[PDB]
Amino acid sequence: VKYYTLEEIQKHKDSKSTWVILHHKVYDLTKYLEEHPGGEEVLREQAGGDATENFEDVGHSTDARELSKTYIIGELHPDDRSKIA
C-alpha cells in the first residue's frame, strides 16, 4: 500500500488534487470530484480533512463501492490519523 502524510491530503484540498481520508484510506476522487451527484463542495469543503463519517453517514451505495475502490491510490499515515483517539 501507499502511505501518504497528512500533509498531502491538506495540500491536496484543491480541485487539482482532491483527496479525502476514508476509513484510513484517502480517496482521490479528483476526476469524480465534479462528477459527484451529491456535491462538489461536500467533498472539497472537507477533502484533505476527514469525510469518513460524512461519507459513511450519507451511506454510499454499492455503486460507490466500485468507484471508491477504483478511485483508490493508498492510505495516509495512520500514525497521525489517530490524533483524536
Ligand code: HEM
Ligand atoms: C471515493 C469517492 C466517492 C464516490 C465514488 C462517491 C459516490 C457516491 C454515489 C454513487 C452516490 C450515490 C447515492 C448515495 O450514496 O446516497 C453518492 C452520494 C453521496 N455522497 Fe458520495 N462518493 C464519494 C465521496 C464522497 C465524499 C467525500 C462525501 C463527503 C464529503 C460524499 C457525500 C455524499 C452524499 C452526502 C451523498 C448523497 C447526497 C445526495 O445525493 O444529495 N461522497 N456518493
